[model samples]
Target: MLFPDDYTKTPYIPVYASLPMGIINSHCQLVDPESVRAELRQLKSLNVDGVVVDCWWGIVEAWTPRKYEWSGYRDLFGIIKEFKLKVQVVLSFHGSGETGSGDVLISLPKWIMEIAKENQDIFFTDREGRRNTECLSWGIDKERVLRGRTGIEVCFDFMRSFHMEFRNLSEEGLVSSIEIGLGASGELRYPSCPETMGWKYPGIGEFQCYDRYMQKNLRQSALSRGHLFWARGPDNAGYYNSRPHETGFFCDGGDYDSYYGRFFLNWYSGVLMDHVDQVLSLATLAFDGAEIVVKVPSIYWWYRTASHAAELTAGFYNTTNRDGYSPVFRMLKKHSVILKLVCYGPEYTVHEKDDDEAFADPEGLTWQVINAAWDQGLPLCIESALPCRNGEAYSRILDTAKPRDDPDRHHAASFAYRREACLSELCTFVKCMHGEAPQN
Candidate 1:
């Protein structure tokens, strides 16, 4: 929860940077502590509160199951501690090995892929029934680990394993939070844009709820809702369609994403909340006073396309449930977990025109989600490229926590942005203290 004394007045713009780019590959590489030292020293000169050491899981255990290498990680922490800098850890549950040549694509222990080779049914499937590559194939991985396993379980086990080695770091105040990855791209959404290798968006660009396990689970859900036929296949379920030409969920350019569409998204967010539970539980092992943050791509706001096929309504999270943060936030309000929007920039987070579609003005949807979340006493976070305009999103985070005068009253407005932090930009915003008002 929010400590009454914290964030009453002063805003804390501590830097949260991702691991330096090109530093990680298939196998984890250890950078010299001195190399890391230079970056820490620079932050120290600028009086940066601290740096979040966001590391990759695939590199840590790149070669084996349960085996972890932290030489580089330890050395870097040594540098941070030496500089008397505070620290937070973002354990990227997913991996972006080899593909790091561009936007990170995949990060998995070799063993996980081994399991996928046999049980292609366990991987995420597109509407046409093509399983994503082992790299992009992480959904509720049913056969990867313990029989009938969820991706959350695999990630938590990895997290707990890491904690066993560095448990003392948190106990020693060297770490503040353990941010865990939730979905494919470390966000709590389905893999919508998996166009590479053999995997890509559906022909109509609709996402897949057709995976065997998902379908099985959805079948049961359909039965419970008393629509057994829809569960059997789309033949009997097409009645709920919003389009005359459209047939079922697995079709291209169809809005029949109404029933089971809401079903799968709602189900998945429940799993996301479970990640929150796991995050809180796991982070505390490192620090009793640590915060638990789960990162998600800002798929919450309203950004549509000419077809309205891929809009929030299709998944039923962003469009319906108060632009997609409500169901997840409902769980968060009770537990006080932190929600960080990864890549909150309009260009990256907002859904832009895809293929040959024209979307209307995209504005104010992200704020609505933030304001509603804050109103519920839920703490919000944003991870992005700083000195960028999205930092403006946090003005409301500061506004939500008012009337502070004590030294203990530092607001938790860490740029949490991984790309970069410059003294001039943060100082610029702090001086003006401009807060944006939420629009409906």
Candidate 2:
């Protein structure tokens, strides 16, 4: 009943709760099924629209290559169907239980890990020579490095299996959307500034193109451009904790604006878009009629900086003079993919009186992304960047999900991170979505 035939205008925007990261164990089994069922029963009573589950690529196809074990997911989905709620399945291709607190260990498949042990070049490589195995490098999407199968083939096979497994759910309207995880943290971005790798807030992240695959591609592209010297990544982009003004690459008229800078940025961003096109093209075939969702990481730090370094490192080539998100939206539109944005303007958008405050413009950045999506006539699904621990956070999320001025442009739904401590705030959020006045 997500889209009913009765109501065409001002459709109801249901709220969904994202289950905890460790809901499924590394062995591909749901932990404490009864307890989770109890939580879902409570959510159903509160009119919570559905549940979002991460079908981790690590756990399902853990042992063998192309072999899937869906017993855990089948049991979990059965319970969800019993509650008469819808679901959004995230095909999480990245590693979990590493960055976030209280997470369980959910690395990639053992075979993939073994391949990396033999050749770490398959994963993304930082300038410091550290390897990022959270996800495979996009450079190898076509390369048959994964035991005779390319990365795209692995992903497509996974999607095909899941689609076949849940054929009944889709027919019954219980499965609403399938979100394709592109890179780190299940968002479409590079691991340019992972906290596990010592990245901190507001520090411009480093580029992750030192991997042999990425280097080879960059060299080929540079040679075609007649500047083989420009094949390597920027050496002066600064570390994970450097301020924008402190780096020569991000300052006004810095290297980011130089001809070489433009060349590198275009390639970096082009690689990301190419990956999007390749994966989603196969995804459309796998899911067929089911709605496909893609997440765009909110790289809002240093938004006011001249070069927008954080976004650049995260594979978005946006700047004061360029429109990075429009091209992304255009690509997504071509694939008919829904854009899911993590709304985080409440905290970073604050008026802090610190030295870095001048570079903080999350509010402006969020709207810029929003308007860009609107320009392409793409439907949006919003998620809170952090759990709503108070009424103010809930209010901000409400404003974004159901904009008062534009009913036609409001999001299709809002997703909130689950936290038992914020049950009261969460309840108020759901009620407000139905046009009810806040009780607290």
Pairing residues by index, what is the TM-score of model 1?
0.73
lDDT of 2 by residue, 369-391 (tens): 88899889888888775444644
Q: Which is the leading candidate under TM-score?
A: 2
lDDT of 1 at 49: 59
lDDT (0-100) at residue 316 of candidate 1? Answer: 30
Q: Mind giving the per-residue lDDT tens digits that candidate 1 earns over 1-440?
A: 11112232244445555556544445555445566777777666545557877667667766656577877677677777898877768777555431123554445667666766777765566666766543333335443443345665556666777677777888888886777665455665555445443322222233555677767776776788787765743332232112223544433334435565555556544434554555555455544455777665543321342223333322434542234566667766665667775434424322444442323223344555556566666766656554444444444333333214324442335555453443544534433232221111
TM-score for each of the candidates: 0.73, 0.93
CA lDDT of each prediction against the hidden true structure: 0.53, 0.81
Candidate 2 regions with alpha-carbon error over 4 angstroms:
1-11, 345-358, 385-389, 407-409, 414-421, 437-440
Model 2 weakest 10-residue run by lDDT: 1-10
Pairs with backbone N, CA or C atoms under 3 Å apart (clashes), candidate 1: 7-410, 7-411, 95-106, 95-107, 96-106, 317-324, 318-323
Model 1, residue 376: displacement in angstroms? 2.2
